Design a protein around this ligand. Sequence first.
Ligand code: 5GP
Ligand code: 5GP
Ligand code: 5GP
Ligand code: 5GP
Ligand code: 5GP
Ligand code: 5GP
Lengths: 467, 467, 467
Amino acid sequence: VRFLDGHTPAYDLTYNDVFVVPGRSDVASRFDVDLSTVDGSGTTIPVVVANMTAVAGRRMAETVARRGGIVVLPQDLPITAVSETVDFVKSRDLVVDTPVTLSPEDSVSDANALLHKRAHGAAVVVFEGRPIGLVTEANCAGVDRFARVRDIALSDFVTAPVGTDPREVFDLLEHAPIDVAVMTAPDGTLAGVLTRTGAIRAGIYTPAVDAKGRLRIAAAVGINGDVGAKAQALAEAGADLLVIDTAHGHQAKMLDAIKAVASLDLGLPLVAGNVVSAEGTRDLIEAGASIVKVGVGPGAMCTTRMMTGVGRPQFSAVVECAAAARQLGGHVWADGGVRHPRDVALALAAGASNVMIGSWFAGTYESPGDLLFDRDDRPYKESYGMASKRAVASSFDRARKGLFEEGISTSRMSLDPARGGVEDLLDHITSGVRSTCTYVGAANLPELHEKVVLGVQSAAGFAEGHP
Amino acid sequence: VRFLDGHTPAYDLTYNDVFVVPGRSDVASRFDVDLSTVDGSGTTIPVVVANMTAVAGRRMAETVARRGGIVVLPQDLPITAVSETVDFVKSRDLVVDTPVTLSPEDSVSDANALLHKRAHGAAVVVFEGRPIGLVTEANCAGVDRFARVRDIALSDFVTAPVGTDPREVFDLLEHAPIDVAVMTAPDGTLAGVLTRTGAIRAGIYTPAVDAKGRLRIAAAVGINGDVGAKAQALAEAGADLLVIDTAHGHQAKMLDAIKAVASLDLGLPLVAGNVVSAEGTRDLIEAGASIVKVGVGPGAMCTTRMMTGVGRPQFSAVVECAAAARQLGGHVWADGGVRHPRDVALALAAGASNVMIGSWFAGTYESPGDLLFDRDDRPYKESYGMASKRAVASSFDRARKGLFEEGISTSRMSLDPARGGVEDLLDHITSGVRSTCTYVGAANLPELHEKVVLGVQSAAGFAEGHP
Amino acid sequence: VRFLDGHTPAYDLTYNDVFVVPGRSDVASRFDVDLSTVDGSGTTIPVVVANMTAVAGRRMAETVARRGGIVVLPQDLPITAVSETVDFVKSRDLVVDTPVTLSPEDSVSDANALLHKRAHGAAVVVFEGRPIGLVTEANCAGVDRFARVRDIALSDFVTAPVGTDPREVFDLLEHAPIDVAVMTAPDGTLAGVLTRTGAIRAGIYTPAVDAKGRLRIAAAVGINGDVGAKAQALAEAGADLLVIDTAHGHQAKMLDAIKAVASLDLGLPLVAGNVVSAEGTRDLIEAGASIVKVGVGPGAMCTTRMMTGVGRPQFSAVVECAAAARQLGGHVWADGGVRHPRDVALALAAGASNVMIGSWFAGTYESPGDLLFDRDDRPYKESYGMASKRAVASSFDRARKGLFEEGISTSRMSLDPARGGVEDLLDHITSGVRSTCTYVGAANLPELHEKVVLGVQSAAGFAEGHP
Ligand SMILES: Nc1nc2c(ncn2[C@@H]2O[C@H](COP(=O)(O)O)[C@@H](O)[C@H]2O)c(=O)[nH]1
Ligand SMILES: Nc1nc2c(ncn2[C@@H]2O[C@H](COP(=O)(O)O)[C@@H](O)[C@H]2O)c(=O)[nH]1
Ligand SMILES: Nc1nc2c(ncn2[C@@H]2O[C@H](COP(=O)(O)O)[C@@H](O)[C@H]2O)c(=O)[nH]1
Ligand SMILES: Nc1nc2c(ncn2[C@@H]2O[C@H](COP(=O)(O)O)[C@@H](O)[C@H]2O)c(=O)[nH]1
Ligand SMILES: Nc1nc2c(ncn2[C@@H]2O[C@H](COP(=O)(O)O)[C@@H](O)[C@H]2O)c(=O)[nH]1
Ligand SMILES: Nc1nc2c(ncn2[C@@H]2O[C@H](COP(=O)(O)O)[C@@H](O)[C@H]2O)c(=O)[nH]1
């Protein structure tokens, strides 16, 4: 990638150590740039939710797929749950979000705990398939925790049929006391709930769909055990994309797994990682992988940097691997070390065909975890590492292996008190990437890579601007 | 610009990463150097107040214009208010500051809130155009908040006619209980209020005036909409200098706006920004701009560095753009990243024809904002970013554009408990620049640029000295 | 008064040391008892606002007079202000409260400070005598403190003509976003503002009015100086009731003042105090006083107990003086030591024809003081003692008298965060007195005195019940 004159630092650079120099721009507005990825994963935004059990669930899968990004299901997961999640996601409206359906016999405690499963802020009490009420934080508060939800003073909702343009439902919700509105099927059954900002987003983002027009989804497999059988069963389960993940993506087991999956000829794009070296990417590409995950160590839950000293600063690894893959025709997914939208913008600028968010999305409403509360009542969630799920594998043998195994690290990802949903994190990331495109003057991601110029900055250079 | 031998860092440098090496000096004192700018903006000190609605007002405009610096009025402002502000500023005494005029029927609360509008520390109660009393924090305290100001125990004031030299009013205020003194017109009407330190400053600073001897003022326009009509109407409104500001100053819209304004042949100097590249400055100069604003990202209210990764360390961008502009004959205004007078001194040293302060001046008495108080009772003010006012542009369209728009960032700029007025910040900045001139040994700003030698310093190098 | 068998304590009892034993009751509800006073002061509730400059103002006067209680104007007040206040009060609607009238040219700071003058929670912006807008804490917040009130985003109000029954305006305000409603004169000019709870209270309370149907008001004079001339001028000023107040109501100066006022034959009822002895009440009654204030020392602002050791527990003094006055046909006002409605109920039970609240009402919205805020942002107000205004009287003489004079004590009366208005304190007091009537079984205040039975309780007896 192009660098400023005289910029040959004697160290690998991270995201905080680099910056983008704006160039001559012809892109008028942020909406004039398209974020469609070229990697073949079919994501209209360069965002992938990581294959972490704390960040990858059915709700996040459907939400991000509707917003145009693919979601990788966590590895080492019972294929029954995988099939259930895939069937759930593929049966979702391309525009309307699936609400928190509440049976009239549910308790107040269950309703209150479920209200935070989604970012809508309200839950639908539905009887016999017909929506009969709405609950929120207001009517639920004060009443007894174990009273039935049929006696929670159900509020009135704005009902509209499925197929009305986002304009009409938007103006319908201009003065609505409750932001959400129930999209009902023509027969009268509830089909979903659409929000004011959801109506806004329905036009900006184009949902990522497969050849059959269903929300794309992905799943991950390890290398321990029969990789071929697991990958084949995953492909038959309906997963659009297969991701083979391990702590070290340059070992012979990784190459054998990629070779087996490629020989299976499943037709789905191939994703392997992680390698932070050009030779590792070359080996993975020659092994039969179309997409290469890059980054071992920058992950916010990754510990190997402190325990082993291995790793690489994310930006330099991403740019070198992207150069290698583009030399061999392959494509690159940056993984780990993403905490600000500048990280996404720089990862795409370095040459990566896509970026993968990880534990940042764990601090969202839709992450498959428990929304706990701290002492100061600030919302947050616990993010865990994959640990043995990303590692190559009687009571004695189990405990002996577990003694030397890296512990499951835990972190507290705080929720935004106002913009807590993953919708708003995606909005921030996409706005940052669009602004980067406008500053560079690129109409698309390949043009972003081609026309970006990057400079090096010191520690004090990062202090410039408002945090 | 000249650098120390062996100093070729592989990264763009910010203000904290550079230092000035003193050379052989013939300038005896700080008062022996003149800070007159060469850019044609006619500012006798190298200080410009930014085109921010939280830092650019009529009071700051008149104060800084009297002290020798130009003020850029915020963009996207009703031309009626622009004309009112320009007429107010052009009708100000070149020596005497306009006080807080208080009608006798004003309440105690209004008087107390108005007392902090200016740095004088006292407000003038004037009846029928004749000054009849003075109020301050002492007599106002304790009395009922809604009692009339005619019953606030008005104090006695030192009255002097307009035209007395600062020497005489200075010695008149040597033992005065109230620091301020009322300069009255020959007919007896109140013309202004002059302070002890104001008398001191009346000789050190030479006010910036136009060809008609009136306090210079500037105004800003965006690129969205008809730039030519807005610029022409601004020129007819009486603005001395036109500033065309946008988030990205290298886009085609910027060039078209500069071309239109230059074709208008208004005669005022042309200011465009922001570009942090030599090619951007070349394009702006060829587009018909005499002065180029440089710096996108270092701004204390700017967020694009964290959201998009775009930007550049301020010092390297300023020096490169200054070199380019001086190659093409243009002149440079550094913008953003100014928090200490060393930043101003380094910006002028890098080659910029002027520096623009920004949110630092928002924490002053004269900034067009509300002087709020924190829990610890330390005075402070809220500084906001321009956001869409610096960005290129039905309810649906409005909300859709606002969803992706960067939020209006807010910061708390604390007031100096003693030297809170913008007069004292200007004193600090000018003292720092004069000391830099003496250390370099330069009699003027062009000599500052010519004879300055700059070295590179590490993180621990910045720790040297008293903070 | 009747006491329980065997209750002959060897100490004077205060309110905390006594309790009422309920008897056989025929009063069904609290609304079945009338609180009309027999003293001739014409107050329909047994509440009098004290002659304290921190608790007695025009707003409190009109409010309490509309609610059925008389207000004594503070002594040592310029008769011009007395006449202005009396004319203001006598020109008030018997049902509608006078709102915070706001001229369109007032500032935001003035509007915000004025909003807390009344308990309505909203202020009326009126132009040319016609109401044009409403302001509250919501629209006022966030906007600049010195912006004009014509640009404070005036809200819509419910307008009704004067004369509509409280039922109609009550149902009109059932779903109103703003609790208050503007009662307008038939010509369209604004006549007042009536609230939802104000509509509720318009039927429960019967306003205290004179023979001409105007809100009754009272004023106070001291004993120093010509008492006769001051009392006569006060009577001509329109004051319905005259109160002669001093620290010691048994001195010869008190008797001479009462004799002079009685010889004036002004026709208004006579109020003198304070005496806590039967002989003092006898002397005051024989001096030509119809009503006797009792209580010197129990006052929450009174200091003489700690400085001099003089005083008396309020309950025993009140009962003894009431017995003496009823023996001579006079009537009694308890003064001081009122902090809970039980104090009012016990004062009326002891035999006092009325009770006088004092500094408790100083912590209200309508008290003539400044609503200050503490560090924890809890609303409160400063209550001051009368000091020399209740004491018998060159720079040397002034300072010599002031050296030995008791200092003006200050106390912090906290505002109720929800029920801060004096309307709600009056509601609490009246509810307590009505409940006491029901528990005793009395249909009126004379029956309360006749049929009440009081017992003595120890320190631990006061701990019973919820505080
Ligand atoms: N009643 C009800 N429970 C729900 C709904 N959505 C999620 N849940 C709860 O959440 C569980 C799954 O959590 P998830 O893996 O989706 O975060 C379900 O088994 C169920 O207990 C809903 O719409 N209604
Ligand atoms: N070595 C290691 N890497 C992990 C673990 N958990 C997650 N990761 C890596 O870190 C990524 C997420 O980090 P993030 O992008 O949130 O900073 C995952 O996609 C995966 O590549 C773990 O327990 N160990
Ligand atoms: N009465 C009075 N108000 C003033 C004076 N200077 C500023 N103000 C207030 O401040 C407002 C403008 O604030 P600025 O934009 O000057 O910071 C005016 O509309 C007025 O309310 C003055 O001398 N007298
Ligand atoms: N991108 C961006 N730049 C801003 C915004 N507000 C101010 N700026 C820039 O930052 C400068 C002030 O920053 P300062 O000099 O106070 O650090 C302004 O003159 C302008 O160039 C904003 O909202 N967004
Ligand atoms: N503009 C305005 N000021 C009021 C109003 N009511 C009270 N005030 C203010 O309050 C002062 C008197 O306070 P008070 O003695 O009534 O508590 C008045 O002189 C005036 O400053 C009102 O309706 N409008
Ligand atoms: N001795 C004395 N009594 C006072 C003073 N201020 C108020 N009082 C008395 O205390 C009463 C109010 O007390 P409260 O009823 O609020 O406890 C007044 O009506 C008056 O009788 C003062 O400064 N000194």
